[PDB]
Write a protein that binds this DNA or RNA. Sequence first.
DNA 1: CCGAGTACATGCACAGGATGTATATATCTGACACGTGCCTGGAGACTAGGGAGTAATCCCCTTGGCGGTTAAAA
Length: 49
Amino acid sequence: NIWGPFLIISPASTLNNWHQEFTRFVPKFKVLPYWGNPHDRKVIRRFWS
DNA sequence: CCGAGTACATGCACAGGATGTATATATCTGACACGTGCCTGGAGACTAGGGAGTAATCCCCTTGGCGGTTAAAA
């Protein structure tokens, strides 16, 4: 389950806190949340698709 | 066997929050905007000459106005 994808459901206000705590926690793992508008959905679609 | 009541289910209303929307603002840039002198094609003034249509008659057709008949409108 390490190499597999993991979807974490967190609030929009705690997304930055989980991103900072995840970056300072495990820097070897990439943190790529999902937020924004249709443009950010196109960027996340180009990167994650 | 029937009525009272307690419990569970449910539905509606209100408030929070997220996302879509639209305008307010910022900024560097193509383009309006503004001199600077050129000049040559225009724009007008000034004599002289032409000419066609306005104006007044007046002769002459083509309108606008009378009474019936059936044919089309109702």
